Coordinates of C-alpha atoms and ligand atoms in Angstrom, one line a residue:
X1 CA 7.0 -14.0 -31.7
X2 CA 4.8 -10.9 -31.5
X3 CA 4.0 -8.0 -29.2
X4 CA 0.7 -8.4 -27.4
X5 CA -1.7 -5.8 -26.0
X6 CA -0.8 -4.5 -22.5
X7 CA -3.2 -5.9 -19.9
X8 CA -4.9 -3.2 -17.8
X9 CA -6.7 -3.5 -14.5
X10 CA -9.1 -0.9 -13.2
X11 CA -9.0 -0.7 -9.4
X12 CA -10.8 1.4 -6.8
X13 CA -13.4 1.7 -4.0
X14 CA -16.9 0.4 -4.7
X15 CA -19.1 2.9 -6.6
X16 CA -16.2 5.1 -7.6
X17 CA -16.7 4.3 -11.2
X18 CA -14.8 1.2 -12.4
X19 CA -17.7 -0.3 -14.3
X20 CA -19.0 2.9 -15.7
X21 CA -15.6 3.8 -16.9
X22 CA -15.1 0.4 -18.8
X23 CA -18.6 0.7 -20.3
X24 CA -17.8 4.1 -21.7
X25 CA -14.5 3.0 -23.4
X26 CA -16.3 -0.2 -24.6
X27 CA -19.0 2.1 -26.0
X28 CA -16.6 4.2 -28.0
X29 CA -15.3 0.9 -29.5
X30 CA -18.8 -0.5 -30.1
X31 CA -19.4 2.7 -32.1
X32 CA -17.0 2.1 -34.9
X33 CA -16.1 -0.6 -37.4
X34 CA -13.6 -6.4 -32.7
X35 CA -12.9 -9.7 -30.9
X36 CA -15.0 -10.2 -27.8
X37 CA -13.7 -11.7 -24.6
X38 CA -15.0 -13.3 -21.4
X39 CA -14.2 -11.0 -18.5
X40 CA -12.2 -8.5 -20.6
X41 CA -12.5 -5.8 -23.2
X42 CA -10.1 -5.3 -26.0
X43 CA -9.8 -1.8 -27.4
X44 CA -7.9 -1.8 -30.7
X45 CA -5.2 0.8 -31.3
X46 CA -7.3 2.5 -34.0
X47 CA -10.1 3.0 -31.6
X48 CA -7.7 4.4 -29.0
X49 CA -6.2 6.8 -31.7
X50 CA -9.7 7.9 -32.5
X51 CA -10.4 8.9 -28.9
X52 CA -7.0 10.4 -28.1
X53 CA -6.4 13.4 -30.3
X54 CA -3.0 14.3 -31.6
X55 CA -2.0 14.1 -28.0
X56 CA -1.1 10.4 -28.5
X57 CA 1.2 11.3 -31.4
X58 CA 4.1 11.9 -28.9
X59 CA 4.2 8.1 -28.1
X60 CA 5.9 5.9 -30.6
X61 CA 4.8 2.6 -29.1
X62 CA 1.3 3.1 -30.4
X63 CA 2.7 2.0 -33.8
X64 CA 3.6 -1.4 -32.4
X65 CA 0.8 -2.4 -30.0
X66 CA -2.5 -4.1 -31.1
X67 CA -4.5 -2.2 -28.4
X68 CA -5.2 -2.3 -24.7
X69 CA -6.7 -5.3 -23.0
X70 CA -8.9 -4.2 -20.1
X71 CA -9.8 -6.6 -17.3
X72 CA -13.4 -6.3 -16.2
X73 CA -12.1 -7.0 -12.7
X74 CA -13.2 -10.3 -11.0
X75 CA -16.1 -11.5 -8.8
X76 CA -16.6 -9.3 -5.7
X77 CA -13.9 -6.7 -6.2
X78 CA -11.3 -9.5 -5.7
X79 CA -8.5 -7.9 -7.7
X80 CA -5.6 -9.8 -6.1
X81 CA -6.9 -12.8 -8.1
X82 CA -5.5 -11.0 -11.2
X83 CA -2.3 -12.7 -10.4
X84 CA 0.5 -14.3 -12.3
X85 CA 3.6 -16.4 -11.6
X86 CA 5.5 -13.9 -9.5
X87 CA 3.3 -10.7 -9.3
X88 CA 0.4 -9.1 -11.1
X89 CA -1.4 -10.2 -14.2
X90 CA -1.8 -6.6 -15.2
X91 CA 1.0 -4.7 -17.0
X92 CA -0.6 -1.4 -16.2
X93 CA -3.4 -0.1 -14.0
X94 CA -5.9 2.7 -13.6
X95 CA -6.6 3.6 -9.9
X96 CA -10.1 5.2 -9.9
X97 CA -11.1 7.6 -7.1
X98 CA -14.2 9.7 -6.7
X99 CA -12.8 13.2 -6.8
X100 CA -15.6 14.4 -4.5
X101 CA -15.2 11.6 -1.9
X102 CA -11.4 11.3 -1.8
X103 CA -9.4 8.2 -0.7
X104 CA -11.3 5.4 1.0
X105 CA -10.0 2.2 2.6
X106 CA -10.3 0.2 -0.6
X107 CA -8.4 2.9 -2.5
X108 CA -5.4 2.6 -0.1
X109 CA -5.6 -1.2 -0.3
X110 CA -5.3 -1.0 -4.1
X111 CA -2.5 1.6 -3.9
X112 CA -0.5 -0.7 -1.7
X113 CA -0.8 -3.7 -4.0
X114 CA 0.1 -1.6 -7.0
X115 CA 3.3 -0.4 -5.2
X116 CA 3.9 -3.9 -4.0
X117 CA 4.0 -5.5 -7.5
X118 CA 5.5 -2.4 -9.0
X119 CA 2.7 -2.1 -11.5
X120 CA 2.7 1.3 -13.3
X121 CA -0.5 3.2 -12.9
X122 CA -2.4 6.3 -13.5
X123 CA -5.0 7.9 -11.2
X124 CA -8.4 8.7 -12.6
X125 CA -10.2 11.4 -10.5
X126 CA -13.7 10.5 -11.4
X127 CA -17.1 12.2 -11.3
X128 CA -15.9 15.7 -12.1
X129 CA -19.4 16.4 -13.5
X130 CA -20.6 16.4 -9.9
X131 CA -18.5 19.4 -8.9
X132 CA -20.9 22.3 -8.1
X133 CA -21.3 24.5 -11.2
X134 CA -19.8 22.1 -13.7
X135 CA -21.2 22.3 -17.2
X136 CA -20.8 19.0 -19.0
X137 CA -19.2 19.0 -22.4
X138 CA -19.8 15.5 -23.7
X139 CA -16.8 13.3 -24.4
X140 CA -14.4 16.1 -24.6
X141 CA -10.7 16.1 -23.5
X142 CA -10.3 17.3 -19.9
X143 CA -8.2 20.3 -21.0
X144 CA -10.9 21.5 -23.4
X145 CA -13.9 21.1 -21.1
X146 CA -12.0 22.4 -18.1
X147 CA -11.2 25.6 -19.9
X148 CA -14.8 26.3 -20.5
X149 CA -15.8 26.1 -16.8
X150 CA -16.2 29.2 -14.7
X151 CA -13.1 30.3 -12.9
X152 CA -14.5 29.4 -9.4
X153 CA -15.4 25.9 -10.8
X154 CA -11.9 25.4 -12.2
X155 CA -10.6 26.4 -8.8
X156 CA -12.9 24.0 -6.9
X157 CA -11.6 21.1 -9.1
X158 CA -8.0 22.0 -8.5
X159 CA -8.7 22.1 -4.7
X160 CA -10.0 18.6 -4.9
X161 CA -7.0 17.5 -7.1
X162 CA -4.5 18.8 -4.5
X163 CA -6.4 17.0 -1.7
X164 CA -5.7 13.8 -3.6
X165 CA -2.0 14.9 -4.1
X166 CA -1.9 15.5 -0.4
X167 CA -3.2 12.0 0.3
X168 CA -0.8 10.3 -2.2
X169 CA 2.1 12.2 -0.6
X170 CA 1.3 10.9 2.9
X171 CA 1.3 7.5 1.2
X172 CA 4.8 7.8 -0.3
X173 CA 3.7 8.9 -3.8
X174 CA 4.5 12.2 -5.3
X175 CA 2.0 13.3 -7.9
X176 CA 0.2 16.0 -9.8
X177 CA -2.6 16.7 -12.3
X178 CA -1.2 15.0 -15.5
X179 CA -0.5 18.3 -17.4
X180 CA 1.6 19.6 -14.4
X181 CA 3.7 16.5 -13.9
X182 CA 7.5 17.3 -14.2
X183 CA 8.9 13.7 -13.9
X184 CA 6.6 11.2 -15.5
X185 CA 8.7 8.3 -14.1
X186 CA 8.4 9.3 -10.5
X187 CA 5.1 11.2 -10.1
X188 CA 1.7 9.6 -10.4
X189 CA -0.3 11.4 -13.1
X190 CA -3.8 12.4 -12.0
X191 CA -6.4 12.6 -14.8
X192 CA -9.7 14.3 -13.8
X193 CA -12.6 12.5 -15.6
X194 CA -16.3 11.7 -15.8
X195 CA -16.8 8.1 -16.7
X196 CA -20.5 8.8 -17.3
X197 CA -19.9 11.8 -19.4
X198 CA -16.7 10.7 -21.2
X199 CA -14.9 13.9 -20.2
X200 CA -11.2 13.4 -19.7
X201 CA -11.1 9.9 -21.1
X202 CA -8.9 11.1 -24.0
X203 CA -6.1 12.2 -21.6
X204 CA -6.7 9.1 -19.4
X205 CA -6.0 6.7 -22.3
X206 CA -3.1 9.0 -23.6
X207 CA -1.5 8.7 -20.1
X208 CA -1.9 4.9 -20.1
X209 CA -0.1 4.8 -23.5
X210 CA 2.5 7.1 -21.8
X211 CA 2.9 4.4 -19.1
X212 CA 3.4 1.8 -21.9
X213 CA 5.9 4.0 -23.7
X214 CA 7.9 4.5 -20.4
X215 CA 7.8 0.9 -19.1
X216 CA 6.7 -1.9 -21.4
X217 CA 9.0 -3.7 -23.8
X218 CA 9.9 -7.3 -23.3
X219 CA 7.1 -8.0 -20.9
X220 CA 4.8 -7.8 -24.0
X221 CA 6.6 -10.3 -26.2
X222 CA 4.6 -13.5 -26.6
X223 CA 5.4 -16.7 -28.6
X224 CA 2.1 -17.2 -30.3
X225 CA 2.6 -20.9 -31.0
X226 CA 3.8 -21.9 -27.5
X227 CA 1.7 -23.8 -25.1
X228 CA -0.8 -21.3 -23.5
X229 CA 0.0 -19.8 -20.1
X230 CA -2.8 -18.1 -18.2
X231 CA -4.6 -17.5 -15.0
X232 CA -8.0 -18.7 -13.8
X233 CA -10.1 -15.7 -12.7
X234 CA -13.3 -17.5 -11.8
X235 CA -14.6 -21.0 -11.4
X236 CA -18.4 -20.9 -11.7
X237 CA -21.5 -22.7 -12.8
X238 CA -23.2 -21.8 -16.0
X239 CA -26.7 -22.8 -17.1
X240 CA -26.7 -25.7 -19.5
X241 CA -23.0 -26.3 -18.9
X242 CA -21.6 -27.6 -15.6
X243 CA -18.8 -25.9 -13.8
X244 CA -16.9 -23.6 -16.1
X245 CA -13.6 -21.7 -15.9
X246 CA -13.1 -18.1 -16.9
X247 CA -9.5 -17.4 -17.7
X248 CA -7.1 -14.8 -19.2
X249 CA -4.4 -16.2 -21.4
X250 CA -1.3 -14.0 -21.3
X251 CA 1.1 -16.0 -23.5
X252 CA 0.8 -18.6 -26.2
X253 CA -2.2 -20.4 -27.8
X254 CA -5.0 -22.4 -26.2
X255 CA -6.8 -24.9 -28.4
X256 CA -10.2 -26.6 -27.9
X257 CA -8.6 -30.0 -27.7
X258 CA -5.8 -29.1 -25.3
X259 CA -5.1 -30.7 -21.9
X260 CA -4.7 -28.0 -19.2
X261 CA -3.1 -28.3 -15.7
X262 CA -4.3 -26.2 -12.7
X263 CA -4.2 -26.2 -8.9
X264 CA -7.1 -27.4 -6.7
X265 CA -7.3 -27.0 -3.0
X266 CA -5.4 -30.3 -2.7
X267 CA -3.2 -31.1 -5.7
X268 CA -2.3 -30.4 -9.3
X269 CA -4.8 -31.8 -11.8
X270 CA -5.2 -31.6 -15.6
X271 CA -8.4 -31.9 -17.7
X272 CA -9.1 -32.3 -21.4
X273 CA -11.0 -29.3 -22.6
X274 CA -14.4 -29.8 -24.2
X275 CA -15.3 -26.3 -25.3
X276 CA -13.9 -22.8 -25.6
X277 CA -16.6 -20.1 -25.3
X278 CA -16.4 -16.4 -26.0
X279 CA -19.2 -13.9 -26.1
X280 CA -21.4 -13.6 -29.2
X281 CA -19.8 -11.4 -31.9
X282 CA -21.1 -7.8 -32.2
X283 CA -30.6 -13.1 -33.9
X284 CA -28.8 -16.1 -32.5
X285 CA -30.3 -17.9 -29.5
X286 CA -26.9 -19.0 -28.2
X287 CA -25.5 -17.1 -25.3
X288 CA -21.9 -17.9 -26.4
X289 CA -19.9 -18.6 -29.5
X290 CA -17.6 -21.7 -29.7
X291 CA -14.1 -21.1 -30.9
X292 CA -11.3 -23.4 -32.1
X293 CA -8.5 -21.6 -30.3
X294 CA -7.4 -18.3 -28.8
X295 CA -4.0 -16.5 -28.7
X296 CA -2.5 -14.6 -25.8
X297 CA -4.2 -11.5 -25.2
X298 CA -7.5 -13.3 -24.5
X299 CA -10.3 -13.9 -22.0
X300 CA -12.1 -17.2 -22.4
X301 CA -14.6 -19.5 -20.8
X302 CA -13.6 -23.1 -20.7
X303 CA -15.8 -26.1 -20.3
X304 CA -14.0 -29.2 -19.0
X305 CA -14.9 -32.1 -16.6
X306 CA -13.8 -32.2 -12.9
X307 CA -12.9 -28.6 -12.2
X308 CA -15.2 -28.0 -9.2
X309 CA -12.3 -27.6 -6.8
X310 CA -10.0 -25.5 -9.0
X311 CA -8.7 -22.4 -7.1
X312 CA -9.4 -18.9 -8.5
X313 CA -6.0 -17.4 -9.1
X314 CA -4.5 -20.7 -10.1
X315 CA -2.0 -20.8 -13.0
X316 CA -3.5 -22.4 -16.1
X317 CA -1.0 -24.4 -18.3
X318 CA -1.5 -26.3 -21.5
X319 CA 0.4 -29.6 -20.9
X320 CA 3.2 -30.9 -23.0
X321 CA 5.3 -32.7 -20.3
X322 CA 3.1 -33.9 -17.3
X323 CA 5.9 -34.0 -14.8
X324 CA 7.5 -30.7 -15.6
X325 CA 4.1 -28.8 -15.5
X326 CA 3.2 -30.4 -12.2
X327 CA 6.4 -29.4 -10.5
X328 CA 6.3 -26.0 -12.0
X329 CA 2.8 -25.3 -10.7
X330 CA 3.6 -26.9 -7.3
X331 CA 6.7 -24.7 -6.9
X332 CA 4.5 -21.7 -7.6
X333 CA 1.8 -22.7 -5.1
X334 CA 4.5 -23.8 -2.6
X335 CA 5.6 -20.2 -2.1
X336 CA 2.1 -19.2 -1.2
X337 CA 0.7 -22.0 1.0
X338 CA 3.4 -22.8 3.5
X339 CA 3.5 -25.3 6.5
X340 CA 6.8 -25.9 8.3
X341 CA 8.0 -26.6 11.8
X342 CA 10.2 -23.5 12.1
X343 CA 9.4 -19.8 12.5
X344 CA 6.0 -18.6 13.8
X345 CA 2.9 -16.6 12.7
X346 CA -0.1 -18.3 11.2
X347 CA -1.8 -16.7 8.2
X348 CA -5.2 -17.4 6.7
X349 CA -6.7 -15.7 3.7
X350 CA -9.9 -16.1 1.7
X351 CA -8.3 -16.6 -1.6
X352 CA -5.0 -17.6 -3.2
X353 CA -4.3 -14.1 -4.4
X354 CA -5.0 -12.6 -1.0
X355 CA -2.9 -15.2 0.8
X356 CA -0.1 -14.3 -1.6
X357 CA -0.6 -10.6 -0.9
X358 CA -0.4 -11.1 2.9
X359 CA 2.6 -13.5 2.7
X360 CA 4.6 -11.0 0.6
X361 CA 3.7 -8.0 2.8
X362 CA 4.8 -10.1 5.8
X363 CA 8.0 -11.2 4.1
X364 CA 8.8 -7.5 3.5
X365 CA 8.3 -6.8 7.2
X366 CA 10.7 -9.7 7.7
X367 CA 8.1 -11.6 9.9
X368 CA 8.7 -15.3 9.7
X369 CA 5.8 -17.5 8.6
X370 CA 4.9 -20.9 10.0
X371 CA 1.6 -21.5 8.4
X372 CA -0.2 -19.8 5.4
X373 CA -3.3 -21.2 3.8
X374 CA -6.8 -20.6 2.6
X375 CA -9.9 -21.0 4.7
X376 CA -11.5 -20.2 8.0
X377 CA -9.4 -20.3 11.2
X378 CA -9.3 -23.9 12.6
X379 CA -8.4 -25.6 15.8
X380 CA -5.3 -26.8 14.0
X381 CA -4.4 -23.2 13.2
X382 CA -4.7 -22.3 16.8
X383 CA -2.6 -25.2 18.0
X384 CA 0.1 -24.4 15.5
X385 CA 0.1 -20.8 16.7
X386 CA 0.6 -22.0 20.3
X387 CA 3.6 -24.0 19.2
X388 CA 5.3 -20.9 17.7
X389 CA 4.5 -18.8 20.8
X390 CA 7.0 -21.0 22.6
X391 CA 9.9 -19.4 20.9
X392 CA 8.8 -15.7 21.2
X393 CA 5.3 -14.4 21.9
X394 CA 5.8 -12.3 18.8
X395 CA 4.7 -15.3 16.7
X396 CA 1.8 -16.4 18.9
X397 CA -0.7 -14.8 16.6
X398 CA -3.1 -15.6 13.8
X399 CA -3.6 -13.1 11.0
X400 CA -7.0 -13.9 9.4
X401 CA -7.9 -12.0 6.2
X402 CA -11.5 -12.0 5.0
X403 CA -12.0 -15.3 6.7
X404 CA -14.3 -16.6 9.6
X405 CA -13.4 -18.6 12.7
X406 CA -14.5 -22.2 13.0
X407 CA -16.3 -22.7 16.4
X408 CA -13.9 -25.5 17.3
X409 CA -11.1 -23.0 16.8
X410 CA -13.0 -20.4 18.7
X411 CA -13.0 -22.6 21.8
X412 CA -9.4 -23.5 21.4
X413 CA -8.7 -19.8 21.1
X414 CA -10.5 -19.2 24.5
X415 CA -7.2 -19.6 26.4
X416 CA -5.3 -16.4 25.7
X417 CA -1.6 -16.0 24.7
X418 CA -2.8 -16.5 21.1
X419 CA -3.7 -13.2 19.5
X420 CA -6.2 -13.1 16.6
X421 CA -6.2 -10.4 14.0
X422 CA -9.3 -10.4 11.8
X423 CA -10.4 -8.0 9.1
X424 CA -11.0 -7.4 5.4
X425 CA -8.4 -4.7 5.0
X426 CA -4.8 -6.0 4.7
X427 CA -3.0 -2.7 5.7
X428 CA -5.0 -2.4 8.9
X429 CA -4.2 -5.9 9.9
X430 CA -0.5 -5.3 9.4
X431 CA -1.0 -2.0 11.2
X432 CA -2.5 -3.8 14.2
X433 CA 0.1 -6.5 14.2
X434 CA 2.9 -3.9 14.4
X435 CA 1.3 -2.0 17.3
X436 CA 0.9 -5.4 18.9
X437 CA 4.5 -6.3 18.6
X438 CA 5.1 -2.7 19.8
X439 CA 3.5 -3.4 23.2
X440 CA 5.0 -6.9 23.4
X441 CA 8.3 -5.1 22.9
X442 CA 7.9 -2.6 25.7
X443 CA 6.4 -5.2 28.0
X444 CA 9.6 -7.1 27.4
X445 CA 12.3 -4.5 28.2
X446 CA 10.4 -3.2 31.3
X447 CA 10.5 -6.9 32.4
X448 CA 14.3 -7.3 32.1
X449 CA 14.8 -3.8 33.6
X450 CA 13.2 -4.9 36.8
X451 CA 16.1 -7.4 37.1
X452 CA 18.6 -4.6 36.7
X453 CA 20.0 -2.7 39.7
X454 CA 19.2 1.0 39.2
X455 CA 20.8 4.1 40.7
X456 CA 19.4 5.3 44.1
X457 CA 20.7 7.3 47.0
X458 CA 20.1 7.2 50.7
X459 CA 20.7 9.3 53.8
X460 CA 21.0 7.9 57.3
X461 CA 18.9 10.1 59.4
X462 CA 20.8 11.2 62.6
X463 CA 19.5 10.1 66.0
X464 CA 17.2 7.4 64.6
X465 CA 19.2 4.3 65.3
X466 CA 17.1 1.3 66.4
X467 CA 19.8 -1.4 66.3
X468 CA 23.5 -1.0 66.0
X469 CA 24.3 -4.1 64.0
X470 CA 23.7 -7.7 63.0
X471 CA 20.7 -6.3 61.4
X472 CA 21.7 -2.6 61.5
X473 CA 18.4 -0.7 61.8
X474 CA 17.8 3.0 61.4
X475 CA 15.7 5.8 60.0
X476 CA 16.5 6.6 56.3
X477 CA 15.5 9.1 53.7
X478 CA 15.7 8.2 50.0
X479 CA 17.5 11.0 48.2
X480 CA 17.2 10.1 44.5
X481 CA 15.9 7.0 42.7
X482 CA 14.1 3.9 44.0
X483 CA 16.0 1.9 46.6
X484 CA 14.9 -1.7 46.6
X485 CA 14.9 -4.6 49.1
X486 CA 18.1 -6.5 48.3
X487 CA 20.1 -3.7 46.8
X488 CA 23.8 -3.5 47.7
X489 CA 24.9 -0.3 49.3
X490 CA 28.3 1.4 49.2
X491 CA 30.3 4.0 51.0
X492 CA 31.1 7.5 49.6
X493 CA 34.4 5.8 48.7
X494 CA 33.0 2.8 46.9
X495 CA 33.4 0.5 49.9
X496 CA 30.6 -2.0 50.3
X497 CA 28.7 -1.5 53.6
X498 CA 25.9 -4.0 53.2
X499 CA 22.6 -4.8 51.6
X500 CA 19.1 -3.5 52.1
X501 CA 17.4 -6.2 54.1
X502 CA 13.9 -4.7 54.7
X503 CA 12.1 -1.4 54.9
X504 CA 9.0 -0.1 56.7
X505 CA 7.0 3.1 56.0
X506 CA 5.5 4.0 59.3
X507 CA 3.4 0.8 59.6
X508 CA 3.9 -0.5 56.0
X509 CA 6.3 -3.2 55.0
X510 CA 8.0 -1.9 51.8
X511 CA 10.0 -3.7 49.1
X512 CA 10.6 -0.4 47.3
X513 CA 11.1 3.2 48.5
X514 CA 11.4 6.3 46.4
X515 CA 11.5 10.1 46.5
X516 CA 11.8 11.5 50.1
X517 CA 9.7 8.8 51.8
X518 CA 11.7 8.3 55.0
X519 CA 11.4 4.8 56.4
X520 CA 12.9 2.5 59.1
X521 CA 15.5 0.4 57.2
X522 CA 17.3 -2.7 58.1
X523 CA 20.7 -3.0 56.5
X524 CA 22.3 -6.5 56.6
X525 CA 26.1 -6.6 57.3
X526 CA 26.2 -2.9 58.2
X527 CA 27.2 -1.6 61.7
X528 CA 26.6 1.9 63.0
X529 CA 29.6 3.7 64.3
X530 CA 31.8 1.4 62.3
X531 CA 31.0 0.9 58.6
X532 CA 28.1 3.3 58.5
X533 CA 27.5 6.5 60.4
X534 CA 24.5 8.8 61.1
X535 CA 24.2 11.5 58.5
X536 CA 26.1 9.5 55.8
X537 CA 24.9 9.3 52.3
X538 CA 24.9 5.7 50.9
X539 CA 24.7 4.8 47.2
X540 CA 23.4 1.7 45.3
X541 CA 26.5 -0.4 44.5
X542 CA 25.6 -0.9 40.8
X543 CA 27.4 -3.8 39.1
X544 CA 29.7 -3.1 36.1
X545 CA 27.6 -5.2 33.7
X546 CA 24.5 -3.5 35.0
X547 CA 26.0 0.0 34.7
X548 CA 26.8 -0.6 31.1
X549 CA 23.1 -1.1 30.5
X550 CA 22.6 2.6 30.7
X551 CA 22.7 2.8 26.9
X552 CA 21.2 -0.7 26.2
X553 CA 18.1 0.7 28.0
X554 CA 17.6 4.3 29.2
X555 CA 15.5 7.0 33.7
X556 CA 14.7 10.2 35.7
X557 CA 17.0 13.2 35.4
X558 CA 18.2 12.9 39.0
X559 CA 18.8 9.2 38.4
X560 CA 21.1 10.2 35.4
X561 CA 23.0 12.6 37.6
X562 CA 23.3 9.9 40.2
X563 CA 24.6 7.4 37.8
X564 CA 27.4 9.7 36.9
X565 CA 28.1 10.3 40.6
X566 CA 28.1 6.6 41.3
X567 CA 30.5 6.2 38.4
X568 CA 32.8 8.9 39.8
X569 CA 32.8 7.1 43.2
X570 CA 33.9 3.7 41.8
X571 CA 36.4 5.3 39.5
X572 CA 38.5 6.0 42.6
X573 CA 40.0 2.5 42.3
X574 CA 39.2 1.3 38.8
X575 CA 38.3 3.6 35.9
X576 CA 35.2 2.4 33.9
Ligands
GDP1 N1 -22.4 11.5 -12.0 C1 -21.5 10.5 -12.2 N2 -21.9 9.3 -11.8 C2 -20.9 8.4 -12.1 C3 -19.7 8.6 -12.8 N3 -19.0 7.4 -12.9 C4 -19.8 6.6 -12.3 N4 -21.0 7.1 -11.8 C5 -22.1 6.5 -11.1 O1 -21.7 5.9 -9.8 C6 -22.3 4.6 -9.5 C7 -21.3 3.4 -9.2 O2 -20.2 3.3 -10.1 P1 -20.0 2.0 -11.0 O3 -19.1 2.2 -12.3 O4 -21.4 1.7 -11.4 O5 -19.4 0.8 -10.2 P2 -18.1 0.4 -9.6 O6 -16.8 -0.5 -10.1 O7 -18.3 0.0 -8.0 O8 -17.4 1.7 -9.7 C8 -23.3 4.5 -10.7 O9 -24.6 5.0 -10.4 C9 -22.7 5.3 -11.8 O10 -23.8 5.5 -12.8 C10 -19.4 9.9 -13.2 O11 -18.4 10.2 -13.8 N5 -20.4 10.8 -12.9

């Protein structure tokens, strides 16, 4: 057993500086007296100590770590592909943000995933050299170069830092410029830097080491002779070689003659490795260097037969026991794909990692999942959604992340009832889904409220009697509420006097009457001069069970007052 290098991802909105930042650290390494990796950069502890001043001396873990293994983040800003059995492949992260631009959509998306997988991170407020009036002091610690700026320049920088603090706060994260942090464990540390200039990088790396000191212990233990465990980051063609796999090994050893298992779009496969390729060491004509093996804390390119359909994000396992590896990979993938008869909600994502991100977020929002898979929305996805709609329209929806819609499914989707949420920003999709369930929720109650007998009051206008009884008919004025056709009416003493049979507003047939409308009303079972009298006030005879639904669904002010009045009336022969 040994302690490996913490794996570090660099996340952030396009053009905010992820690449430039990595190149600068790479450069400080290149300029010294280092193993090369495919898709990653290892910065040895001695290099880190050379960049960080005596500032690093406060962190004892530096004496036990080999260095920091930076991931040169995947294809097209994927980042969720940097996955591992359970959560993130990265042990730590740097969230880069342009200090002059502020938080952008991609920035918030990364922030949500970092919180989701509880990955410790630091925030690098990049491009400080672009603040008006800034005088560059090449590769110097932030504190040193900052103290040489004009006072109004120092102030402009802090204004931008506090804007970031403001944004992180709205997002549920307390934070501060790194040197003003009071609780390192609960506040995000913000390090202002210039990736192009090198300014601030020393405190940036020092804070990363601070994150390691605070959080990383057993997660870094590796068994260097155990069968390698890794994650496939890319599956791509390479000139002269066929399909190739770029992977990061996070535990164990991978040898050039090993058999490795992985997941394809259909099943678990294994392949016997032909070559392990790493970049040329620092006038060979070869683009790569062959290697016999590699030990955890490595990025490698693998050449092996039928890997065309291997999924990016798939676990990579050296095989000892064929059945155990297969079931172990299947169980992992099983919690991400999903296809059952129960629940509802159909999810489609562009990659395994993204699908996993959506599935987890949904599971946190306690939304059941019927289908979750990779690929464009299909007719089958639509049909399955329709099936789930049957037991709550809350599930009659398809959440499609960075995926297109198959024409066949487009047509199937023609008939409504099936809501389609499309987008390349996970938090927005979840935002939209909630405000969607929101409406569906209101549209539901209002619907069952229409079936509830509400409070309403009526006054029998004197001298406007058109029929004494059988259908009793007379002029009426609605006092409070909304009297409806069918409503039961009761005496001032709770005695039932009849039901509203029909109403008419001048020449209009009304099923509902409100305010002080005054209409000719027919009251079934009532008889003038006997059970009802001119001038009387009549009240809706609200049922007990219906009355109780004052709390289970609450209604004008006058209506409220009336409800109490109606309660007082009926309480004359049965309290409550
Ligand atoms: N002035 C300035 N430009 C920077 C800085 N960091 C990055 N850039 C520039 O911003 C552009 C995009 O950033 P880049 O690292 O290349 O790619 P990325 O992962 O999308 O961030 C490039 O033109 C960089 O040269 C910085 O600190 N200062």
